[PDB]
Amino acid sequence: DIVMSQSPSSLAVSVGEKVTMSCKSSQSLLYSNTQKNYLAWYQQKPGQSPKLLIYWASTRESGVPDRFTGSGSGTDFTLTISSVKAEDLAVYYCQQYYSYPLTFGAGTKL
């Protein structure tokens, strides 16, 4: 399949540090007829439920501050954040829905 890919496990971003995480599908993400990337994500914190991060990387959820804005198309992507903050501290799951089943990131705990 594609079990989405975030490894090796230990990295971190101190006071004023943009975050480094990379999730990469194992199938080509330039696709023929549709031509809009499909990518899913999540955030698992202490105190409430694990919850989606980002959808289509250029369209963000409301109730999601713009602080997470990623780049790239295709298998691997590049995130950029003007200022990373606390609740950015989180486990970041990653996923794609076009060809089901739904499989999960090796995960960003950054």
Partner: protein, 460 residues
């Protein structure tokens, strides 16, 4: 199957030059200045021992169109500088810095003792300074310099490691930057990583990783473009012989020796370190500031240069002298006391560069459109014939947002001014762009070549 550049290369007849203002540079020998509570630096520690590396920023030639544009199509080709020639200004009279550490692990001399030493007080550290390997160098080429240097190896899980054990061992091979650590030959590496003591060395050399070229792998580039050139020179040897004093890593098998007793019962230092002697200097040893030349090089690159962009590096011991100040916070009293004098230091630094160049022109075939695309495509990124016809006509305006009912609120998109990938690497930078001009009649030097040329000098 790389080929020479000049296989395909198409020359110009035509040349420009620039040379810097010069170099204004100074700063402190030992460590940089900052507010004590703070991390914000007042003033840089600056040293020769900081690796000496500078890099090139230049206009696209294709930008300038010509009094005679005729001779070529800008489209069916591209138009690409070559370096014809080079010169560094290096101006200081030559100088001696020197150093060591106020605390030092040492037992003592090796050579001279009438008797075995006495007992060891703990923390016997002492203050001594030393000289260095006596050296210049120059480094010339277009791809990043990369130093290779020791590392601590990877302990595998076989031996369970015990507190204080030997770090396994490595050579690390890694990008060069400016302002990095010369060796005296104390090993190319960081004790700060790889030495617990922190009392072992000159402060400065405590800091960071000694670094040294890898010709070989720079020799080993497929294209040899890290540098196509450099020169390398030095002199030195040892001055004295001195023992460290520290807790035992390991000991010598007895069979190798005999046994003493009493006074002689006890172990003479296996910690053995020399004290180096760097040598005299001379004018003639100067390699600097002289017409500097190539045509053929070891690599296919001949003056083959990209991003209008090149890397320059050199190093010299010779000038290492600083000078300090005696600061009298009171001038009033006329009778002497050591009281009144604080001391400060900086190391002043100076250079210039004047360099000769050519342009060349490049038509287009797959090879062209590929071999380098193959080789690296980054330039045809910079060119426009990388193609890429896209899809994607239409969208929807929707306006306006400010209405306070909510359509998703929007765009983030400066996003990628980012072009230098290696930009996080941080080091000196020199933009040259508009310093170019025609005639060395006007340009103090390479008319040297123009005479090396000769050619008739043209009338008035």
């Amino acid at each position: 199957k790389v080929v020479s550049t000049d296989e395909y290369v198409a020359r110009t007849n035509i040349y420009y030059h620039a040379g810097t203002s010069r170099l204004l540079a100074v700063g402190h020998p030992y460590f940089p200045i900052k507010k004590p509570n703070n991390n914000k630096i007042l003033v840089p520690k600056v040293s020769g021992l900081q690796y000496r590396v500078f890099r090139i920023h230049l206009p696209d030639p294709n930008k300038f169109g010509f009094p005679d544009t005729s001779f070529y199509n800008p489209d069916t080709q591209r138009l690409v500088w070559a370096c014809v020639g080079v010169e560094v200004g290096r101006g200081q009279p030559l100088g001696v810095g020197i150093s060591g550490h106020p605390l030092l692990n040492k037992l003592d001399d090796t050579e001279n003792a009438s008797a075995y030493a006495a007992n060891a007080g703990v923390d016997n550290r002492e203050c001594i300074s030393m000289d260095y390997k006596q050296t210049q160098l120059c480094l010339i080429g277009c791809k990043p310099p990369i130093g290779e240097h020791w590392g601590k190896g990877s302990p595998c899980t076989n031996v369970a490691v015990n507190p204080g054990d030997c770090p396994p061992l490595e050579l690390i091979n890694t990008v060069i930057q400016d302002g990095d650590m010369v060796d005296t030959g104390f090993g190319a590496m960081d004790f700060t990583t790889l030495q617990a003591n922190k009392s072992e060395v000159p402060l400065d050399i405590c800091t960071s990783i000694c670094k040294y070229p890898d010709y070989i792998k720079m020799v080993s580039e497929p294209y040899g473009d890290s540098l196509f050139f450099y020169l390398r020179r030095e002199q030195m040897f040892v001055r004295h012989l001195f023992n460290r004093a520290g807790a035992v890593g390991e000991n010598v098998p007895d069979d190798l020796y005999i046994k003493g007793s009493g006074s002689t019962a006890n172990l003479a230092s296996s910690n053995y370190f020399p004290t180096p002697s760097g040598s005299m200097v001379t004018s003639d040893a100067q390699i600097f500031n002289k017409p500097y030349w190539l045509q053929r090089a070891q690599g296919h690159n001949n003056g083959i240069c990209w991003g209008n962009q090149l890397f320059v590096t050199v190093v010299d011991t010779t000038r290492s002298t600083n000078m300090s100040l005696c600061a009298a916070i009171s001038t009033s009293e006329t009778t002497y006391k050591n009281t009144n004098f604080k001391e400060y230091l900086r190391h002043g630094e100076e250079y210039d560069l004047q360099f000769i160049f050519q342009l060349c022109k490049i038509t287009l075939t797959a090879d062209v459109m590929t071999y380098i695309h193959s080789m690296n495509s980054t330039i045809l990124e910079d060119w426009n014939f990388g193609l890429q016809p896209p899809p994607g006509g239409t969208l929807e305006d929707t306006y306006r947002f400010v209405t306070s009912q909510a359509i998703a609120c929007q765009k983030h998109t400066p996003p990628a001014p980012k072009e230098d990938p290696l930009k996080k690497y941080t080091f000196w930078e020199v933009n040259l762009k508009e310093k170019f001009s025609a005639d060395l009649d006007q340009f103090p030097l390479g008319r040297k070549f123009l005479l090396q040329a000769g050619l008739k000098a043209k009338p008035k």
